[PDB]
Assembly symmetry: D3
Homo-oligomer: 309 residues x 6
Amino acid sequence: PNIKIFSGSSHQDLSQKIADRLGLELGKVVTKKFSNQETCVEIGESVRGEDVYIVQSGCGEINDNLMELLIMINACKIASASRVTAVIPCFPYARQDKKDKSRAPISAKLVANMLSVAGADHIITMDLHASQIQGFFDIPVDNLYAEPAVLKWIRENISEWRNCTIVSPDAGGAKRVTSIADRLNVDFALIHKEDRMVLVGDVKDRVAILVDDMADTCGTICHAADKLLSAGATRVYAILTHGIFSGPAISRINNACFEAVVVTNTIPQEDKMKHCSKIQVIDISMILAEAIRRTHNGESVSYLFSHVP
Amino acid sequence: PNIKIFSGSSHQDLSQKIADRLGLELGKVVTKKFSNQETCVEIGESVRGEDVYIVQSGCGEINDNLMELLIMINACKIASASRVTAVIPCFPYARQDKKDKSRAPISAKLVANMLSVAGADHIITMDLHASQIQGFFDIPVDNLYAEPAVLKWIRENISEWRNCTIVSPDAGGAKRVTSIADRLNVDFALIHKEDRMVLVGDVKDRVAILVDDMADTCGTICHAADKLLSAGATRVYAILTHGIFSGPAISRINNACFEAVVVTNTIPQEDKMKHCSKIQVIDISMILAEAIRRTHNGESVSYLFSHVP
Amino acid sequence: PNIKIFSGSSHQDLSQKIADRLGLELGKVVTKKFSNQETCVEIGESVRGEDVYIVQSGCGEINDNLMELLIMINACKIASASRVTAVIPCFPYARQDKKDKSRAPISAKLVANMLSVAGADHIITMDLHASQIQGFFDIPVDNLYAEPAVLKWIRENISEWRNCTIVSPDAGGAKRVTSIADRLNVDFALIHKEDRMVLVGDVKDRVAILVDDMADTCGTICHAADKLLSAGATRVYAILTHGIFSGPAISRINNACFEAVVVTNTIPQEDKMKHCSKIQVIDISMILAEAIRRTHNGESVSYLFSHVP
Amino acid sequence: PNIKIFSGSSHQDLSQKIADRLGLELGKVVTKKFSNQETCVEIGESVRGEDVYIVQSGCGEINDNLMELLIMINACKIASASRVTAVIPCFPYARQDKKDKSRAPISAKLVANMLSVAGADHIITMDLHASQIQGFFDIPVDNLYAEPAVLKWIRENISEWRNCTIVSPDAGGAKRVTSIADRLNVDFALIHKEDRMVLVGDVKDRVAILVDDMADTCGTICHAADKLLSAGATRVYAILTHGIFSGPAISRINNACFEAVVVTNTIPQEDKMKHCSKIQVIDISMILAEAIRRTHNGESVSYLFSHVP
Amino acid sequence: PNIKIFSGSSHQDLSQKIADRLGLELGKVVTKKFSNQETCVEIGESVRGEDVYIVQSGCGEINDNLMELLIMINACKIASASRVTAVIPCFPYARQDKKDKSRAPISAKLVANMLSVAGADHIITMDLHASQIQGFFDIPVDNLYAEPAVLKWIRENISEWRNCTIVSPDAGGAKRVTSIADRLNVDFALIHKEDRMVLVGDVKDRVAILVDDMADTCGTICHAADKLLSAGATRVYAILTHGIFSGPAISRINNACFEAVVVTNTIPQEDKMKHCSKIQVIDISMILAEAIRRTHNGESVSYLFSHVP
Amino acid sequence: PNIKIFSGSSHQDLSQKIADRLGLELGKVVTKKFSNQETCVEIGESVRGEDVYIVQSGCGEINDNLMELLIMINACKIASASRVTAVIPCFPYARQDKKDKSRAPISAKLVANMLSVAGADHIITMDLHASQIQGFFDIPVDNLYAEPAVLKWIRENISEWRNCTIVSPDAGGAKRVTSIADRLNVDFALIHKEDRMVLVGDVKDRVAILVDDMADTCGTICHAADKLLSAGATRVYAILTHGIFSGPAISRINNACFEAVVVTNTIPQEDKMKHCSKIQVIDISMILAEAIRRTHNGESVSYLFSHVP
Ligand SMILES: Nc1ncnc2c1ncn2[C@@H]1O[C@H](COP(=O)(O)OP(=O)(O)OP(=O)(O)O)[C@@H](O)[C@H]1O
Ligand SMILES: Nc1ncnc2c1ncn2[C@@H]1O[C@H](COP(=O)(O)OP(=O)(O)OP(=O)(O)O)[C@@H](O)[C@H]1O
Ligand SMILES: Nc1ncnc2c1ncn2[C@@H]1O[C@H](COP(=O)(O)OP(=O)(O)OP(=O)(O)O)[C@@H](O)[C@H]1O
Ligand SMILES: Nc1ncnc2c1ncn2[C@@H]1O[C@H](COP(=O)(O)OP(=O)(O)OP(=O)(O)O)[C@@H](O)[C@H]1O
Ligand SMILES: Nc1ncnc2c1ncn2[C@@H]1O[C@H](COP(=O)(O)OP(=O)(O)OP(=O)(O)O)[C@@H](O)[C@H]1O
Ligand SMILES: Nc1ncnc2c1ncn2[C@@H]1O[C@H](COP(=O)(O)OP(=O)(O)OP(=O)(O)O)[C@@H](O)[C@H]1O
Ligand SMILES: [Mg+2]
Ligand SMILES: [Mg+2]
Ligand SMILES: [Mg+2]
Ligand SMILES: [Mg+2]
Ligand SMILES: [Mg+2]
Ligand SMILES: [Mg+2]
Ligand SMILES: [Mg+2]
Ligand SMILES: [Mg+2]
């Protein structure tokens, strides 16, 4: 059983980077639309008895990409692939992980059920919005972390990183920032709203680094950055694993005081970089490629939680 | 347990017509998109212990509508609805009902599995592309027929209907046309391609009526109509239950010789009628409403296969 | 189909209170242990065609109680009960809702799967540790809130409640306290550890009310209370929906500065009240009884999120 | 994991031919009936960790053979076989693949469900009546085609094959005949009933070859052959992949004008050949053996759609 | 939801008796065979929203009857019956309930799985060979007992019943006979083989009554009766709930010393009574009818374990 | 894929013996209790792609051990183990394998369902109380037999074993004793209660050996031994595969006439041996180790039914 990497249409550059790091060519697949806009998928090579990995992120036209992924999984499964793995760098509907006093769907659970029923045997993803989403599955889920790559970027790009403060934009992400603060041996601050925000932790004359899983409309991080500059911070960075940047995010970032907005490439960023000078991209294709290769060879994946490959 | 009718965003006029025929108001639901284009659904009223019917056709932005339907089904199911029924007038991915010497998905089966796993207890649909799709489910599926309404339209709109010929555009649909030919006591002709088409059955000086389940790009029916005019037909009609009309269909119909292109309203048609004068719409909301009401009350649904309500 | 309420051995007083509020007698069931300590269950009355509710909390001997609940559910399901509902005021293994960089089980998901496979059709619980646990099920889950009863207690027991500060012991519970702070129109403070704790929000000369879902060993709330007294608070209360009080909790509370430690009766408290004077109990049996009665009659359960019955 | 081939009682000659082509001996199994006519199955060798293939066609005493197959699958699955594959050359109940305005079962779907629940991991079959039956499964199904062997037979047995006409007995099978007509570069004709039949396509002074998936009572092919002789055909052949030949088929064929009735050996034919001189048998055991060997070794099976091995 | 009783072809007299006791007519169903011997089923009336009971015993052509039952269940389930119950007086493959050091199927479990996957919601049966078969299902199973009817027959037909001895033919059935011996206040004896049999319990000058669940070949009961006459018994009776009587059973009974061989009518007996004078039939249609009516109305079924209705 | 053996807390000595016989070290796992007595499990090494065997018997605190086993299975399954096998020497709730005229659970079936839903792929157990429990699973179950080890012990410990009588304590176990009696070529006796017991078979001046699957309270075997001494037996032995010894068993055995009470070590016995001199232990760790090694290597397990390794 050999590795076969297939790309959905969502993030083809990431799939190519992963394939190069694995020393493989992308599997032959046609993924287009019929005239009535139904997804058309044709696997152009035999996957019989192979270990198939389908790379598709929850970005762009999310429902189209999700249906493409489900259809590709189904096609590979009924084509007698030995194992089918969904590599989903940004998990769609992850923020709908609970009801919370509303007659709302748990869309993340529905997506997990659909992936299971399509025939996925395994899920590889990066920085799930809530790690409880792992429990939405009955198949194994490897939730990778961008934190090693983030730490690497911080050390090689922020000269004052030993005196910086890692800041959570809200009370929800504090855990994450504390982890980073532990790995860098720096202070960590929290910010939460009472339209006013309150900040705990000295940030004067120090570089502040907001850290988060995602930036969708960037209202949260822009408000946090305004507060950090109010409290005497020297420069404010924002580091996010998922740069969705929908709606007014680009305009707000352009009008914000960030020195840089670093995001990983779990979502393609070329279009946003055109209209926003301060967006920078961390490659995480090495982490994804190593996770694929370790799941295939039966090596430890959790080794990657703390080690940059 | 009362009837609750909910509308997806795909076909709101049809849902309203069904609700009026049932003497009900449409259930309060918010169906919009988040900024990153994920579907947002909020059920605005309690559905606890109710018989819920969600109306959504496989039309327009098909993957968006399908995800909306799945999310709404999930929301109603975890909101403790007694029973959830999907009313899908045009079934999405119905034409991908087999592989046939290709490494292709069976997308119709995947859609059926997704509907089941979302929590659908029952499916109501009209003129499935292949009735074998009923076997793709383990829940009951009521596949209604537009044929009674088509027969009614033919009798009240074609003055020469007693001397007409019902024509299949291809060998696949012959069964359907024979059924119609049996109910009208008229001749039935077949047409199949060898770029040339061959026609069996006298059509000279007689009105010809092409009959089909759907018109997507209308290449099939336009070629058939050209052949029918070649063979001396007086006027050529086309009657289809599903008017998808994607791609170049409107231009081809405008350049074709059809007296009329009659379609049911399983798919909204207002935009197409603007650009195509010869499209006409049969209302089938009475059939759908009667099917909903009969499934709710435990009356016979198959009664509708031959009776216009 | 009538309501049948059955009690597990974990919390018989709560089951009796619920049964009285419903105007019913507890169903005849024998729940003992065989000599080799296997659970023995015998349903002493016919439950055929009935709406069965089994009350069992995740307290005391947790694995014994959980197995008792599963066995009782199975016995009722194979005895042809029309519907079986598990009323689990405190959900066992709720704190094991994720893996988080550890080769650990997701025990909450396992418990959900076991409840589903035993035959539960519905779950009623109170203040799930994480509401994402709702997504661990495919059956409906009604997660009730003790907040209405807590607000009632605060108003009728704390004379200075209009000038009080609602305090979260950690960043995780802030949402909850904000909700309470919104319903009382008072200030809300956060506390988080950097062995030192940092507090945001004025608490001097004001009554402080720590709020939380559970108190197991009470290290968190005792440290928070020490910090609140350091910051000039007048009196410190603690209000928790689940009073587990395991390990050294009673000694720590006895040595702490709390004016009172209010907990709901989702877990029996009589033994702890003997050794701890400042524990007080809020009855939530009315909320549970109303939820049972509303699920049975098909009325709105979410009505209870904001209304004391 | 090695190949183990087991024979049901339905078609032992085919199983032996497949085993010889694989270079294997048939696995030791006892398949008899108890006194009360219940199937008795005993696997006479260990299948632990093996790739098991059970050969059983839907022929003869169909319900007995189907139950034998299910029981053998179950016995191998609980005996810890690594993988169990059902090799079903003629799929039982394949013609009950839809309801079609009748309160009828979808028996093909029921058979698929029973095969899945017995523990089949994979299905190998030949010329499914409708390829939509593939969607009735969630396990992979390889639907082989007798067409390569049919083309070989036509070329080596019909001297005038370059000037022949391939004829469909009905509108349903046209696809199949067109495929054959494409591979031979000959004309293709259709025949359909209006008790009268209409034929399109010149057949005078040319050899006609009716092609079909199965012949049960042979009314269809006998009527088609009568019509072909009416239209001036020189000789009429019939080629079917499944020679069921039930009821009056043998008498009708004996009284028909066929030069030969060629069928594959998916169903044993020795008894029918005794009473019908013009039946001839194509061996397809090479196709089945190659499909088994390619599924075992992870090679391409679809290679066989166009290549005789 | 009303009761609908449908008969399979296995035991039509029993179905009619049950229908008369329920005050109902048998539901319109066609159950025949296609030419190729596949089961053909057509439900001749709407079962939508009804409580359907299908009566079919594991007798005669067992695999044909079992397939008929599965097909009828499937037809009713996809016809939107509210509930489908299989009434199986004699459960097929019940004696294959374990493997026991053999590479054998557990055919009873396979049958249970097939019944569940066909769509059965409930099973009613009489005197399961092993009551552990109840655990083979996940749906409720009501296993009725012929013992009340047997006790009635014994009292009204054996004048010396107060001084009789109830005898088990083997060690396996002892429980059953003890139950009967308890309800009659008589002695109970056991017989087991060491070709020789050993009997415990005085039987001289007393009427002996062998009791058993089934008689297939009647070797067991004939050997037991020979031993009982050896030990000085006056008359020997045999009472069995299931009179299968396959193979040489009729000849052996004719050559045996039984005064009577009483069996219930879970299996049709008219043909066997023609060739065997000493077979007598107990009607158990009242027990089956009462069980159906009590499951429908939600009354206690276990009431029937001790009460003749 | 390598063998990984993990021990639950129930029987660590047995797990160590098995690990030594396999030439392996026990896998690193932490199995403790949280403060509130919930099971805490942490797998201390990667099990990705491994063949995992978890050893846990149904002994001691049965519900705690069962929950530990389920949690460990779940942890290994979501840690991407290739295969997870539960090695359960004494199966919990095995005696609750049926309902039998009681509104009781089938707890054995519930346990089987829970093991399956936790993710077990395979079960290895010894002397199931009823072999029908094998049918409670859909995964393969290997039910090993202590009989080879028992025969070995009898030959090497009872000098008069050629003239002994193997005695069943009840009618239920007769099969077992007959098997042993066949393998030793000795007489076999039965004992059953009418408070009086009746014995068939000469036992005077001969050593008697009671044989059974388990001894819980030892009332059965103590009464049987009293009867055997009444009937002139010289010495009475008892041999049981499962020595549960709960309740008053130790006192009764101490007051009984047994020469020895031999049990296997499927359950730890050190504590009972302290208070009971006549308990002796047969090691069956070789049988379990050989079964594990044969399932891993795909060799025959049933070879062990008759051969001591
Ligand atoms: N794609 C989306 N875009 C925007 N909002 C979304 C999206 N999906 C869900 N939501 C909504 O966003 C809210 C969830 O917000 P968020 O995840 O930031 O906070 P939380 O879950 O309440 O708390 P926290 O993550 O801090 O523990 C819900 O109301 C949910 O319905
Ligand atoms: N939405 C779609 N639009 C266009 N083509 C589609 C769509 N979905 C599937 N197809 C393709 O269309 C083909 C199916 O065509 P069609 O249903 O007209 O004929 P058929 O199934 O071969 O025969 P028939 O319906 O006459 O029995 C397949 O190749 C399928 O992949
Ligand atoms: N019964 C239990 N008693 C104590 N600790 C437990 C128990 N069950 C699980 N845990 C452990 O407690 C930790 C979970 O702690 P907790 O719920 O307080 O914080 P969190 O989930 O990390 O964050 P938060 O709830 O603030 O969002 C995990 O390490 C888990 O293994
Ligand atoms: N074993 C059988 N023998 C005979 N008739 C059968 C059998 N099984 C099902 N049938 C019936 O035969 C009919 C199906 O016929 P057939 O497959 O020839 O045509 P179709 O499915 O209507 O169309 P087509 O295959 O041309 O697209 C149905 O009425 C079905 O109930
Ligand atoms: N229909 C059948 N006719 C005859 N024998 C059968 C049938 N089905 C299974 N058997 C076989 O009969 C045997 C089962 O026999 P039986 O039920 O009389 O005894 P048991 O299960 O060993 O013990 P007991 O029922 O006394 O506890 C098995 O070998 C089984 O394979
Ligand atoms: N752990 C247990 N300890 C004691 N009794 C139990 C236990 N579990 C179940 N029981 C009860 O013990 C009885 C089962 O007894 P037992 O297995 O000895 O006999 P049986 O199943 O009736 O017949 P036999 O095994 O001889 O065929 C049932 O009433 C069951 O509820
Ligand atoms: Mg969130
Ligand atoms: Mg956030
Ligand atoms: Mg088609
Ligand atoms: Mg078509
Ligand atoms: Mg907390
Ligand atoms: Mg045909
Ligand atoms: Mg018997
Ligand atoms: Mg016993």
